[PDB]
Design a protein that fits this description.
Length: 246
DNA sequence: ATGATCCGACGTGTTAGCCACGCTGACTAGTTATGCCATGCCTCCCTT
DNA sequence: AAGGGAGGCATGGCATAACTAGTCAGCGTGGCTAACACGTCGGATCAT
C-alpha cells in the first residue's frame, strides 16, 4: 500500500510530499495529531517548497547577473541617498502607483545594487520581474524585428511587472534602433514600473539615442510617474580597492 | 523536450437589410448544318 | 488461317443558307453581408 501511496504522490506531481512521507507518518504516529491539521501541515510545507522553487525559476528566467538585496547595502558609505526613500520603495507602492524608479550618479555608487535589490524584493512578493541592460534590450528588439517577430519580443519586454534597465548611457545606442527602446517606454507607460539606472543626465539622453525629439518624448513618458534619486559619493569599487590595498 | 492546462482570439450561427446576380425578351451577328464532290481508308472476299 | 486485292462507303473540304447563340436591357428574387452572441479551437506557458 505504501508503494501505491508513493506512486500516487509522484503522479499528482508531489515529489517533496513523497520524499517526506515516511517522516510525516512517523511524526503523526508518535504524536497524536488530527488528520485535518496533519494535512494542513503537509500542504503548507509543499506550498513553501513550491514557492521557493518558483522564486528560483523566476530568478533564472529574469537575467539578473548577481543576486543582492537591500540588507547588504551600506547607507553609511553612501549618505547621498536617504534610506527612508529606499525603504518606501521596498514597499512596492510604486507598482500600484505605476511609478518608475530612476537611479543616477557616478559609476559604482550602488545604482545597480539598489536596482537588483528592488527587483529581488518584487520577485519575492510574487511580482513578475525582468532584468536587462539597455544595449542588450535594443539589440534583442532589433534582431527580433529583423526576423519579423517584433511583437513577440515586445510582449516579452512588456509582460513583466517590473522591468529593470541597467547601464543606460555607458554605450551609445544605434540611432536606427533607439525607437525600439521608446516602444517599451511607450507601452509600459502607465501600465508597469520601470527601474532604470544610468550615469548620464537627462539632458544628455539625446546624445545617447542620437535623436533629441525621441529622447525628449522618452523622458516625458518615463518621468511622468517616477521617483528620481541623484546618488553621489566615491565609487564603491575604488573604496574596496583602497581597503584591500590598505 | 513533451504534455497538460489555462487563457485569449477567432469562427460560427442567427437575423435583418440591402445590393448584385439571374432570368427573360428582343435584336443582331456569327457559327453551324447541309449538299455536293472528291479522295482515302476500311471492310469484305478470295486465294494460298 | 493469314495476306493481298478490290470494291464500297464514309469523311473532309468548300459554298451557301438558315437557325441559334450572344449580348443588352429591365425587372424580380435570392444570396451575401453585417452585427451580435456564444462556443470551440489554437496558442502560449509552466511543470516533469
Ligand atoms: N553601498 C554598497 N553596499 C554594498 N555593496 C555595494 C555598495 N555600493 C556598491 N556595492 C557593490 O559594488 C559593486 C558595484 O556597485 P553597483 O554595480 O551596484 O554600482 P553602479 O553605480 O550601478 O555601477 P556602474 O555604473 O559602474 O555599473 C557591486 O558589487 C555592488 O554590489
Ligand atoms: Mg552599476
Amino acid at each position: 500500500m505504501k508503494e501505491r501511496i508513493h506512486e500516487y504522490c509522484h503522479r499528482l506531481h508531489l515529489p517533496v510530499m513523497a520524499e517526506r512521507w515516511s517522516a510525516m507518518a512517523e511524526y503523526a504516529s508518535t504524536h497524536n495529531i488530527s488528520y485535518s491539521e496533519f494535512l494542513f501541515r503537509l500542504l503548507e510545507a509543499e506550498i513553501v517548497e513550491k514557492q521557493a522553487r518558483s522564486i528560483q525559476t523566476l530568478i533564472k528566467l529574469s537575467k539578473l547577473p548577481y543576486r543582492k538585496t537591500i540588507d547588504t547595502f551600506d547607507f553609511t558609505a553612501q549618505p547621498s541617498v536617504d534610506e527612508r526613500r529606499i525603504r518606501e520603495l521596498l514597499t512596492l507602492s510604486f507598482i500600484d502607483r505605476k511609478e518608475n524608479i530612476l537611479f543616477l550618479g557616478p559609476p559604482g555608487i550602488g545604482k545597480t545594487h539598489l536596482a537588483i535589490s528592488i527587483g529581488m524584493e518584487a520577485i519575492a512578493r510574487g511580482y513578475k520581474t525582468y532584468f536587462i541592460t539597455a544595449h542588450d534590450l535594443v539589440n534583442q528588439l532589433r534582431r527580433a524585428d529583423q526576423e519579423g517577430k517584433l511583437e513577440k519580443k515586445l510582449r516579452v519586454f512588456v509582460k513583466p511587472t517590473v522591468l529593470i534597465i541597467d547601464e543606460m548611457g555607458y554605450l551609445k545606442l544605434d540611432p536606427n534602433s533607439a525607437h525600439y527602446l521608446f516602444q517599451v517606454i511607450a507601452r509600459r507607460y502607465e501600465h508597469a514600473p520601470i527601474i532604470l539606472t544610468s550615469n548620464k543626465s537627462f539632458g544628455e539622453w539625446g546624445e545617447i539615442v542620437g535623436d533629441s525629439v525621441l529622447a525628449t518624448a522618452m523622458l516625458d513618458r518615463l518621468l511622468h510617474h517616477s521617483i528620481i534619486f541623484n546618488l553621489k559619493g566615491e565609487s564603491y569599487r575604488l573604496r574596496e580597492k583602497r581597503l584591500q590595498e590598505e
